[PDB]
Paper text:
Integral membrane proteins belonging to the multidrug and toxic compound extrusion (MATE) family contribute to multidrug resistance by using either the Na+ or H+ electrochemical gradient to extrude drugs across cell membranes. MATE proteins identified thus far can be separated into the NorM, DinF and eukaryotic subfamilies based on amino-acid sequence similarity. Those crystal structures revealed a similar protein fold comprising 12 membrane-spanning segments (TM1-TM12), they nevertheless suggested different arrangement of cation- and substrate-binding sites between the NorM and DinF proteins, hinting at substantial mechanistic diversity among the MATE transporters.
Hypothesizing that NorM-NG would interact with verapamil differently from DinF-BH, we determined the structure of verapamil-bound NorM-NG to 3.0 Å resolution by combining molecular replacement and MIRAS phasing. Notably, the verapamil-binding site overlaps substantially with the multidrug-binding site in NorM-NG7, with verapamil and drugs including R6G following similar trajectories within the central cavity and projecting themselves towards both the N and C domains. Furthermore, the bound verapamil in NorM-NG adopts a folded conformation, with both aromatic rings stacked on top of each other. This double-layered conformation bore little resemblance to that seen in verapamil-bound DinF-BH, which does not involve π-stacking between the two aromatic rings. The most notable differences between the R6G- and verapamil-bound NorM-NG structures reside in two extracellular loops termed L3–4 and L9–10, which cap the multidrug-binding cavity in the transporter. In verapamil-bound NorM-NG, both L3–4 and L9–10 moved away from the multidrug-binding cavity. Overall, a small number of amino-acid side chains make direct contacts with the bound verapamil in NorM-NG. Among them, S61 (TM2), Q284 (TM8) interact with verapamil through H-bonding interactions, while A57 (TM2), F265, V269 (TM7) and P357 (L9–10) bind the ligand via van der Waals interactions. In addition, the carboxylate groups of D41 (TM1) and D356 (L9–10) are ∼6 and 3.5 Å away from N8 in verapamil, respectively.
Numbering used by the authors:
A (entry chain B): 1 to 91
B (entry chain A): 5 to 463
Amino acid sequence: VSSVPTKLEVVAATPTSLLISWDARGEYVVYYRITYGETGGNSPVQEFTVPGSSSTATISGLSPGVDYTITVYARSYYWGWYSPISINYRT
Amino acid sequence: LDRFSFSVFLKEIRLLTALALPMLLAQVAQVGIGFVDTVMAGGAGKEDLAAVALGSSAFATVYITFMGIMAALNPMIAQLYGAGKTGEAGETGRQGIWFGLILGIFGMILMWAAITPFRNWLTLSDYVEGTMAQYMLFTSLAMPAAMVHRALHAYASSLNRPRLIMLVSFAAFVLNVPLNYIFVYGKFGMPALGGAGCGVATMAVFWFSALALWIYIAKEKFFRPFGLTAKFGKPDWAVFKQIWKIGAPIGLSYFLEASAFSFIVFLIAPFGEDYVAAQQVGISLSGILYMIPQSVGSAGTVRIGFSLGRREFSRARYISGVSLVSGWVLAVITVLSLVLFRSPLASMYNDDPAVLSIASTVLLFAGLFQPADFTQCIASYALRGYKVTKVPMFIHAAAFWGCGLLPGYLLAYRFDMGIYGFWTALIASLTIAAVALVWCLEKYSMELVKSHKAVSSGL
Ligand SMILES: COc1ccc(CCN(C)CCC[C@@](C#N)(c2ccc(OC)c(OC)c2)C(C)C)cc1OC
């Protein structure tokens, strides 16, 4: 029983692509995943995935400036998942 | 057309206790370079052709310009003090200190060289035992500029936090210049009289403040990577090329007062040159308590661009008001104790050259420009202070000079007692920043809407 990664920060973009620099204060026995959907659930989900203190990274921004809703995932000792936090602010 | 400047006062919530007051101690030390200049000014009076300052003057010219360029790292290293690699700020610190040479060299070289033509076409002068003997103490008076940059690069690595040393090695500075300036202007056993051994003498003590830098890696954790600080990768080395678009336009914007040069002194002499020329106890004592003021934005500047790196978005651009106006406090309180008083001819032991028979048609911009700009550039010193912002500050001043065209011959083109007459659209050039500038600052203050792309996370 806990909380998320924690912080909420895309800063912006290289229009097409985007920054995603979030709270990841150190790592854990860790791993991350980020969702890669917009906000319809139509154009499917995608999975970036990373490790260290590394919620503080960035995407492969694929289309124009439509609403994109993007989650990041905790993981630790028990190979299971702290809690995700998520956000949608898209271009 | 009513308010293209949106949220007025709301650079505010309850910030009362923003203790940006090591910032004072950027200008508690920075009074130091004040409180030398005039020892050299009021020491080389024991020579009366010590108008030395004629050099020590148009020296500051290429110092203070290039110093702009260098005052440029005041963001650089705060912006990355919201980081951890004080050595990847360091690799920059080093990289600038390297720059700190480089320019200082190439600058002091312009001096080093060009100088001579202190005589050209509509041009020349000739008290030779005067500063001709000292145009050869322009040089000595010049030959630090290599080492001064490197030792102003100093305070650009005070940025960080600990501003304590700067205070020390400037209170341990006029420790020296008395001492050394006597010995080297006169009292030998053995270096007798390079009489204007102020310029010889001052220049000495740059090198001393310079390795009053060095001597303060000592304190805490390193900022030392000056192993052959290098430059190259593509066309030319960034973290150097980087330092360009910040540096440049603050010097070329310090070319503001570097033409509040051709003005502040040019119609000090029509057929009436009396206390018109004496607007120097005017605009020298203008400059004196202008630093302790304005110099705090050139100190606010940290508190922001750093508090940007530490990702505290506008939890700091909305201190770039609570500073703005915490000095705006003093903006008035000492324009009050400005126009108020006149006793510039302090009768204790004596003065420097400012003397008794003059009117005080000078307290009349102890108002004009004095509170209405106290602030108006410490805008940028937080625009840059925070941000890229001097690319259009360079151009902030595309008007603050080039709108003084007739606000130059507007003292001499008058209807009343127009002594502050061309202090027209140059104290109104000077208040087209309470718009132009801070108006920009609550607009780009509000890219911390654009960049704070997620107001509040989980808990
Ligand atoms: C960057 O220019 C300067 C600005 C302020 C000062 C401080 C002035 N000091 C109180 C010294 C006395 C002022 C004085 C000198 N020297 C002076 C003031 C202003 C001058 O024009 C900028 C000046 O000509 C160089 C000399 C007197 C003799 C006319 C010196 C400066 O250079 C000498």
